[PDB]
Ligand binder design. Structure first.
Ligand SMILES: CCCCCCCN(CC1CCNCC1)S(=O)(=O)CCCCn1nc(C)c2c(C)n(-c3ccc(C)cc3)nc2c1=O
Length: 147
């Protein structure tokens, strides 16, 4: 293959998403805790989160990942699909990743066009594109329910 395909596969085979917390950015209280690897591609993951998260002005997303491979510029492109059409796009950059390292990464998700939980629940899918700089490594998807 292009050998970039092989590098991308190398990075993916050595990557794990170990845990993720979603916090109310006002209090730090944990609204949702996940220990399963919801970055695995080729599946449609599901996350059931408390509907009150929709009333937080901001959510602090704190995750922990491991990577056997070095990355020059680990970053995410995330698309929020509502009823199959892109509603919002998020961009987050981690930067350099030491080979065989385990790293905690905090990002703030900030807010309007806010719809009720009954409308959003089961109709929101987050597509996450995992890049090292300009190299697309993987794409994973999670469907959100607001309970
Ligand atoms: C227009 C908005 C409509 C929809 C609601 C917006 C979403 N809301 C945001 C708040 C903001 C403040 N106003 C209220 C709403 S929300 O419901 O609180 C999201 C909680 C967090 C959503 N989330 N969930 C999971 C499970 C994620 C995973 C697995 N990965 C991931 C990371 C790295 C890799 C490699 C792969 C995947 N990233 C995830 C992620 O971002």
């Amino acid at each position: 293959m292009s050998a970039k395909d092989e590098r991308a596969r190398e990075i993916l085979r050595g990557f794990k998403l170990n845990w993720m917390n979603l916090r109310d950015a006002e209090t730090g209280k944990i609204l949702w805790q996940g220990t399963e690897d919801l970055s695995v591609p080729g599946v449609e993951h599901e996350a059931r989160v408390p509907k009150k998260i929709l009333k937080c002005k901001a959510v602090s997303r704190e995750l922990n990942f491991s990577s056997t491979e070095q990355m020059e510029k680990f970053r995410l492109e995330q698309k929020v699909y509502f009823k199959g059409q892109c509603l919002e796009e998020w961009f987050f950059e981690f930067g350099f990743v030491i080979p065989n390292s385990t790293n905690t990464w905090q990002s703030l998700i900030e807010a309007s066009q806010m719809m009720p939980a009954s409308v959003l629940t089961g109709n929101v899918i987050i597509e996450t594109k995992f890049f090292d700089d300009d190299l697309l490594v993987s794409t994973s998807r999670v469907r959100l329910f607001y309970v």
